[PDB]
Amino acid sequence: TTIHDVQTTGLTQDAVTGFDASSRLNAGLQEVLVDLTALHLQGKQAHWNIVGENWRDLHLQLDTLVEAARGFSDDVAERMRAVGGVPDARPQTVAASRIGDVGPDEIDTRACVEAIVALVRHTVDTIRRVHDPIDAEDPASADLLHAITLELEKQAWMIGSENRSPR
């Protein structure tokens, strides 16, 4: 069996096409990718540069967040590839993210909790914004977005509880 045998039977990538995402779908995932990638960069920045009370817990929880964002970035980027899109998470493209910035300096732990919670909440904000039209077109892509939302919001609660009083 040769490439010719296969082509005449019509069992080829060109004859049997898959789901091809709309440029809207592809663009919504792209936004999520940028924000997830900025998140793990800023996350690591904070990881190294935190100082002050309850240092270790925060150092470790920032690594957990970094790990999740890295994994989710790969998942979204590859979801794009699977649906015909082309991801971009080069540093210059990622720099245009609006999730926030922890700065170049050492950061008090208490202050870092607030900044990171905001950065995570901004990344979730993007997913929730793009979710409905993605779900409408491709429910399976929205399912991936559901996993990312659950995990980020879980971590947002865990990290932020450090700075809360009872209600």
Contact residues: Cl ion, CB under 5 A? 70, 74
Q: Least Å distance between CB 55 and Mn ion?
A: 8
Q: How many CB atoms lie within 10 A of CB 99?
A: 21
Q: Is 67 in the site for Mn ion (CB under 5 A)?
A: no
DSSP 9-34: HT-STTTS------HHHHHHHHHHHH
Contact partner at residue 8 from its own copies, Mn ion, Cl ion, none, CB < 5 to 8 Å by partner kind: none
Q: Is 153 in the site for its own copies (CB under 8 A)?
A: yes
C-alpha distances out from residue 40 to 73, 112, 134, Å: 9, 14, 24
Helices and strands in the chain: count of H runs, count of E runs:
6, 2
26 labelled binding-site residue: no
User: What residues from 121 to 150 belong to the interface with its own copies (CB under 8 A)?
Assistant: 121-122, 124, 128, 131, 135, 139-140, 142-147, 149-150
User: What residues from 45 to 64 belong to the interface with Mn ion (CB under 5 A)?
Assistant: 54, 57
Q: What is the distance between the alpha carbons of residues 121 and 63, in angstroms, rounded to a whole number?
A: 17
Note whether 89 and 77 are within 8 A (CB).
yes
47 labelled binding-site residue: yes
Residues that bind Mn ion (CB under 5 A): 54, 57, 74, 143, 146
Question: Can you say which residues are annotated as belonging to the binding site for Mn(2+)?
Answer: 47, 54, 57, 74, 78, 143
